[model samples]
Target chain A: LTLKVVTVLEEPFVMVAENILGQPKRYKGFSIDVLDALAKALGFKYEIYQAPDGRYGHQLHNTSWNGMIGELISKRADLAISAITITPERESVVDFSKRYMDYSVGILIKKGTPIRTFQDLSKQVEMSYGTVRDSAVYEYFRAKGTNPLEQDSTFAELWRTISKNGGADNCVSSPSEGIRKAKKGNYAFLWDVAVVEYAALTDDDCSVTVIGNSISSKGYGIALQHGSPYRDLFSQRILELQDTGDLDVLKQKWWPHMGRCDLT
Target chain B: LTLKVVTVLEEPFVMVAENILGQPKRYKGFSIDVLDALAKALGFKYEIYQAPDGRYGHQLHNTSWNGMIGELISKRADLAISAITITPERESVVDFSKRYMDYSVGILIKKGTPIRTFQDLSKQVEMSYGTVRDSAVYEYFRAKGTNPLEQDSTFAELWRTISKNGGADNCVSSPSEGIRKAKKGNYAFLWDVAVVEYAALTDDDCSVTVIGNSISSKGYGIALQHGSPYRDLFSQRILELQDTGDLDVLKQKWWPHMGRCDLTS
Candidate 1:
């Protein structure tokens, strides 16, 4: 059987594609390429549907599943290959394939900015706003009573605001996106891990740093509709891929663009 | 082709015939009757084997390809139907049917003295030990950095010491053994909720209580051999049985003896 996979456009992973018409189109980033390869291994022809909003997992809980993501929830789509974090709360609704990447929360900053720690951000005023991200981040901080001002909704938006200097003092987002924006020399801090290391490696205009704390060590898994017949096959394959070095090759392909592994 | 099924004398579920004239005999427990019904659904006759131990999940692991459990590993045993816990660790060894029971850790105590809190016995060392259950209780605690006691090797041994007052101030074992022994008013505690609650509801000699503050939580599943030729068929039947309530009936038959409710539902 064929599979329709939903994905969200994250830099170096998935991005918007454009045809000769100069209209916006969507396409897979490095991670999606790996997924495409994995799907081929299963001998399945697949269709890629871009998730409308970056918060596919978050929206799934509220009954607003979008794009291919909506299809996944309704059984219209067979699977979703994205950087979806696995949490006990979400597993009740959807099953996750084995984690492909281990990531943590870190901070991103302008090369010479003074913003250093999570506590340091709290001390400053007029710091524009912070991003709310997916339900995983929302429920996480809400459960812990941690607050991020303005709830900009998605990490992509938070990064865009900082990159374009859209009247925001700083953008708080995942280390990956934060580092991407920080390369513009505008956004001061991105609160994530991989992206910060990524930016530090690629751009001289950006310096990525972490909060020196954990934003809940979580695993990112391929999202499958809960109880979907595909879970076992996907989980088993994910394990097999991990056991082999194919997963590492995929990571290497994406890491450079994300600005990680600084040689300098 | 008939599948070769292996089973243990799970009390109230699969019970073995007591010592006979020369050869060992086996009998089905109330729970095993459900297995008989299930086997008919798939057209299979089961061969009974004396399981090595009576711990949740341990029986499942023993069937691994590498060790004494090599029976299933070597393709000698086709199916294993016993009280096995499903864990990521065990999942590494074999696939499991959907969980049939949700198990909780429980505490058992003799009459007149009930363990109300962990603080009550924190400092009062009474030379208590534990049961030798292979269900990973010790590893479970070790992960949390809580050593029950340095001297105790397993929960069962602790039960014996506490049951007989062998210098151990208390015995920490499974709810099954704890309920069975507490009737004598010798041991103070047991640690499995489902088995203990089953005992409390069925028997009058001892009392069982859920630890309340979760010491740990896990689920119980039927163990299927790794890469079983019948993996798909077995999994499908298990879900069918669970959906049809055959598993619930199994609970009803054995739980009453231990005073348990139809937790399978």
Candidate 2:
């Protein structure tokens, strides 16, 4: 059967943000690119679903049951390809294949800031947390119970103010966003390491660096509606890609342009 | 020139933990098991220096730098096989070769506890953190201006608790210790995925489970002392192993038994 994938917009992978036309356009990133080759090797037909980063998470489920949100489970789409993490919480609702890649949790700040360590981040806002509306970071931060404040839906309005050095304060997102923002010198640093090295290379302006020890491991995998036996198919396909060396090639392609804030 | 190697009393890798005699015995875990095979393939001659985990980091400077703690930068041990992470802060001090395996961070815990999500760990508790004294995690928890606690090492203790369950209440230590201790149900959990997995499988009673997202993409590698252009050789050697099916075979052997925490135990 053909497979369908839905993911949030983040550069070098999936950029679901509004394009120049102010419409949602989906472009493949490193993971997407590798999964494409992976699917072909596995003999599975696939399609892409471009969901706005804000709504992607909820779209996957109804009332926190992830598989409930996908068109694939309801026979709409077959699969999803983006940086969706595999957690026991999500596993309760969805069936995920093996983790193809591992990521770390961190924050991205505009350049030349004083927040040098993870502890500094938990402290009373020398800077405030900024992130996309209802993004993954939102849940993670909330889960941390670090702040009593609530996240706003319209982050774009605050993007400029928040992104501006010492202006709005820290913007919360994956290391990818931090790397992208930091390169513009609008942010101080991206608080991630694992993938930030690649994030910082996105441009000359951004730098992805580490403040302290890693927060946690983020494992990415293709999401299948719960109880779907196709999980095996998806996993087997990923392994096929590994054997063909397609995954390695994709990593190399993205690795060059990616930033290494910590290294630099 | 013969290469000098520094190893720890680890099992299956640089086996020296103990045997029936309760004395240091040489053995090899999958890591050392595979590395030895690779060594035979690469035709490199080396020596072994075993010590407590705490001293390994300090001694790295002997090879990482020329001599002084923070002085003349020169090559020491040609390559280190011990479990070492390539961090940016560390890269500043010395250069590392290519990653040999996928060594992400993990946690070790009792088999029956239900601390699944990182959120579950948001609250503070009366736990203690114990890793090698003067270790990287110690310094990381006490970063400048961050101040985990005070001179009492309250902040240090709190952070250490996360890794080792903060002493007995937490008992955080190197992934190896977490794995070993968890087998005895000593601490609530251990931090660091790569080492924890290997340690968990070896123990009869303990298992390692994931806590939070991978703390970072810290992989194992043969660290070349400070200023060595050996990355070329190291990277090539790594790719060679990856190219040959040997890497996969070695991983299958270690991972199936030592790779993940089989909660069924």
Candidate 3:
């Protein structure tokens, strides 16, 4: 059966491309490669689509879901692939295949800043900090009962929040966006380690550094409809791909720029 | 010419032992191995001895020096190697070879504790914290102008501080002793990452965890007497060791137990 796959604009996971000569084309990334391998292995055909809203998926207090989760939960799509983290909250509403990657929240800061560790970041009064609206990082601080500014919708606004005084000093978003903002100086961005490593190695600003220690361990998983039949098949294929070294090859293909930053 | 090397008792950096069956045994650790590599590369012969005082060479207002730094400054010892950090204060009196190892101060806490991060540890009033007296970790907090109770000279005293209602909450000392105290379940020790990582991996209790971010970046350098003739040769040998992957091999030999802890434990 041909399945409809929904994704968002998260990089190295899914890089969405729209309307090439007025006709849609599929994307390519770590997640995209995994999907292709899974399709070939499982004898399934799938059509790729982008989520109308660029959210990974979070349910509101009103019990309505947004982003790919909204699309998958309503059965509008068969699967949602991106750098979506597997959380109990997300798992409670939808099914997630076994995690394909593991990472934790890391702080990205400009070189020569006094904020060497998490303690300094928490105690620094002169600096403002923020996270992406409705992101796991925003929810993380919110869950800690210590609220960080989470109003910025894009990396640009987050950069603005960091650039100006009397505004948010720390901006949280996807790792790619935060890494981009960290090059500007006087800012700290918290995100997962995979993208942080990628940015440190490849960003033009070689001064970008992943400082502090990992905050918490988490996994990135593929989201599907609750109890979807394809979930088991996808998990099995992922394991097979992992065992055959296909996934590792794909990671090297996509994340080729490793260890360029001289972090040590 | 055999040179006298003064070292200290920091674990995973300098594990000092003497006269095992009167064999005049040398130390073994990351620093010890680096010294061996440097000796091989620089064609130097050395004798290993402990510092007369266990201090890392601190200067006093009276302009007198203490610890290994004192020995080097007075020309009593030709070299000092351990986990001695390169700092401006120490550099003023003694010359430091180029850093062979870079490490940061890490926090050691008991497993399953409420303190998941440094913020949690700092904000939690119910918890008490301290580091090894005269350690870089202790100096780090002291330099921040927030004094931690540093009176405890022994792990027993530090543990008492943790067990009692009002005393030192965090105990600082050698990583082995601090790791021992951490297993008892209410204290945190901040020390260099090498020892911290060692304890987390090798401890039999399997309940020690190094949590939170590093306090600061520091490098371990071989200390020598000011204007020592061997300084340039030693620094060049260290660079050669680094370039030839010898240093990496030495690290593996000394720090082979890395990643033994699953992190949560």
**Top of the candidates by TM-score:** 3
Chain B TM-score of predicted candidate 3 relative to the true chain B:
0.80
Ranking of all predicted structures according to TM-score, beginning with the best and ending with the worst: 3, 1, 2
List where candidate 2 sits over 4 angstroms from the true fold. A1-264, B17-27, B51-54, B58-76, B123-134, B138-186, B206-216, B227-229, B243-245, B257-261
> Candidate 2, DockQ to 2 decimals?
0.04
Worst 10 residues of 3 chain B by lDDT: B145-154
Which candidate order results from sorting by DockQ in descending order? Answer: 2, 1, 3
Model 1 chain B poorest ten-residue lDDT run: B256-265
Better candidate number, 1 or 2, judged by TM-score = 1
Better of 1 and 2 by DockQ: 2
DockQ of 1: 0.02
Off by over 4 Å in 1: A1-264, B17-26, B30-34, B52-68, B112-135, B146-186, B201-216, B244-246, B257-265
lDDT of residue A6 for candidate 2: 65
How would you encode candidate 1's per-residue C-alpha lDDT over B1-265 as one tens digit per residue?
5666566544445666576688757666654665676678778777666544432333344343432234455566676666555555555666655445554455544434434544333333452324324335434433323233222233333334433443234433444554556545544444555555555555553343434333124445566677664654554555455434355446655654233422220
* Model 3 Cα lDDT, one tens digit per residue, A86-147: 66567667777655655466667666677766556666656555555556555554433321
lDDT of 1 by residue, A1-264 (tens): 677888876665666665658655657566686677667777777777766655555444656656544656678667787666554435545666545565455555554456655545544454433432432333333322322322223333433343334323343445455445555554444344554555565565334343443322455567788667666666556555543435545665656423443332
Say which docking band candidate 3 falls in. Answer: incorrect
In order, the interface RMSDs are: 17.2, 20.3, 26.6
